[PDB]
């Protein structure tokens, strides 16, 4: 069946996740207040939320078994390219198909199409993003699968700028086989039907979403009054050729 190592890896990712994703969203009070006046009225709040989320994705990444054997250069490359993707992935936990929004426990912290569209990004991003959420939601992944996907997403050997791809690849396959085996031994059919194929496809959707994000990020970061509403970490990770 599974494996002691694999069960070890799973146990670690679940805990790493519980330590980096607060289901109460208590820290959201500290962000610059949300303003639902693009009016860019949401940019200060969503910028802080994203920035904060980058810090949590980094924290989760460090606990990914094997990520520590990578060099800083590789670790930095992997996080710079995966951050936004993992943030869209982990956000699935708060997304509800009831009203197609990210319900972050609180009306002020409940975000929908018109809110996330008020931060300088267009529907060319938001449309596919919600679609992504729905499709991912419909997979009804076990939380074990959820964290494995986030981890696999982080340690992808094909990210531009990777050095020791072999090591990155080794680390990822380990996670993949853990995933493939868990689905087979722990995810009952029919819900297990082509589940691994449907999760890997979501990794392809994320690249696409990531690509569109880079395009729209640069667009608004090339405008000084906008880039000054962001945070220093966002500028570092997403780009600061402003």
């Amino acid at each position: 069946k599974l494996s002691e190592e694999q069960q070890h890896i799973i146990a670690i990712l679940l805990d790493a996740h519980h330590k980096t994703y607060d289901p109460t969203y208590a820290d959201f009070r500290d962000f610059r207040p949300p303003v639902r006046m693009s009016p860019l009225s949401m940019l200060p709040h969503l910028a802080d939320l994203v920035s904060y989320s980058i810090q949590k994705v980094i924290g989760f990444a460090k606990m990914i078994p094997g990520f520590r054997d990578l060099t800083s250069d590789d670790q930095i490359v992997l996080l710079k390219s995966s951050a936004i993707e993992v943030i869209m992935l982990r956000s699935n936990q708060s997304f509800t198909m009831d009203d197609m929004s990210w319900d972050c426990g609180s009306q002020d912290y409940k975000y929908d199409v018109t809110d996330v569209s008020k931060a300088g990004h267009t529907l060319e991003l938001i449309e596919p993003l919600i679609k992504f959420q729905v499709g991912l939601k419909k997979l009804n992944l076990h939380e074990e699968e959820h964290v494995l996907l986030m981890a696999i997403c982080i340690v992808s050997p094909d990210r531009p700028g990777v050095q020791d791809a072999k090591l990155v690849e080794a680390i990822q396959d380990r996670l993949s086989n853990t995933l493939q085996t868990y689905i087979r031994c722990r995810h009952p059919p029919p819900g297990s039907h082509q589940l691994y194929a449907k999760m890997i496809q979501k990794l392809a959707d994320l690249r696409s979403l990531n690509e569109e994000h880079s395009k729209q990020y640069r667009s608004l970061s090339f405008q000084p009054e906008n880039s000054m509403k962001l945070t220093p970490l966002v500028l570092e990770v997403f780009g600061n050729e402003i």
Binding site: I58, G59, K62, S72, D73, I76, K80, L233, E236, V237
Partner: peptide, 11 residues
């Protein structure tokens, strides 16, 4: 390639 904040958060 010079990401003090990211670098610092990673170590």
């Amino acid at each position: 390639k010079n990401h003090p904040m990211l670098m610092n958060l990673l170590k």
